[PDB]
């Protein structure tokens, strides 16, 4: 499904990303916008055979199992199909892990190119929360 920006902001804040690893809520909302255009079914194939899944484009090499990624680690311990759900619980809980490796949100390349350093607080203005 395609999330609306404020509804995604509310579910992300409820699931604990506001200020997770010091990154304000607007960062995660902006990330979803540029990684998948807020579409929970988005998929993106990589040259290393991995695929990026869901609203936060979680990579199949290190985070979830898709059975077709060659040297996969399934740190999140889940099938990638579970990252394609309308329910973002599993993607947010895996995204938390992704952000805690010592490098912040830098693995989300579209975040890095489109959101980082920008006025990401704008992505949540006009939202209940």
């Amino acid at each position, epitope marked *: 499904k395609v999330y609306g920006r404020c509804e995604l902001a509310a579910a992300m804040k409820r699931l604990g990303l506001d200020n997770y690893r010091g990154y304000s809520l607007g960062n995660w909302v902006c990330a979803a916008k540029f990684e998948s255009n807020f579409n929970t079914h988005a998929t993106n194939r990589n040259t290393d055979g991995s695929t990026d899944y869901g609203i936060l484009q979680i990579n199949s090499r*290190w985070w979830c199992n898709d059975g077709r990624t060659p*040297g996969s*680690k399934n*740190l999140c311990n889940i099938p990638c199909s579970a990252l394609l759900s309308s329910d973002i619980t599993a993607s947010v809980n895996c995204a938390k*892990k*992704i952000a*805690s*490796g*010592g*490098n*912040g949100m*830098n*693995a989300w390349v579209a975040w*890095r190119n489109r959101c*980082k*350093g920008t006025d990401v607080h704008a992505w949540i203005r006009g939202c209940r929360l």
Partner: single-chain antibody
Amino acid sequence: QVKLQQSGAELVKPGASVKLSCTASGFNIKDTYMHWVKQRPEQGLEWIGRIDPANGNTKYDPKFQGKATITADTSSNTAYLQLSSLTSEDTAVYYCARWDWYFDVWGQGTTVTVSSDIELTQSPSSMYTSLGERVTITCKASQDINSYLRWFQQKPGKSPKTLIYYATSLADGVPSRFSGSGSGQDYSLTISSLESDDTTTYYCLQHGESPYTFGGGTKLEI
């Protein structure tokens, strides 16, 4: 060819200042956090701080704030470490590093010679093992959150290598023989048949809450 070239062994008098550098190649530092680590002559690892070079924001272990300052210059791809009022306790090897799931890389280190809070407990401090024995080292904390713990292996004279990520996942290229376990506060590293390449010092690092902290280490001897 991914790398961090550390610039300069130095000898200084008590009270002097030194500024070290760490230039990277293969990746832009603006795209990362750059961490600095201290290691005294027969002692353990200590996290000093990190810098986010894209915006210059830094985070320190409060004990180093005022003595060590991290700085970064993105056009030169270089991160720096400035140390002030140097004393006997500052004689150490200082590494820069990029920590990222399955992408850890460290500089070769740089020796500085001065010449005139989560607790990680590592057991055993030192041990003698045999040629095909089963070894289990442990690491106990004060609630590491779920498994934000790295296992590093350091050989005499080399930068530490990462063996385990997220407590139980093997690094790329690490032999089958190694394995990690636990969640919560209690973690372990097991080597089934100790191979001869395994003689070294093992350290656990918690990156679950900031200031990142290291266990005291375990020297395995064959």
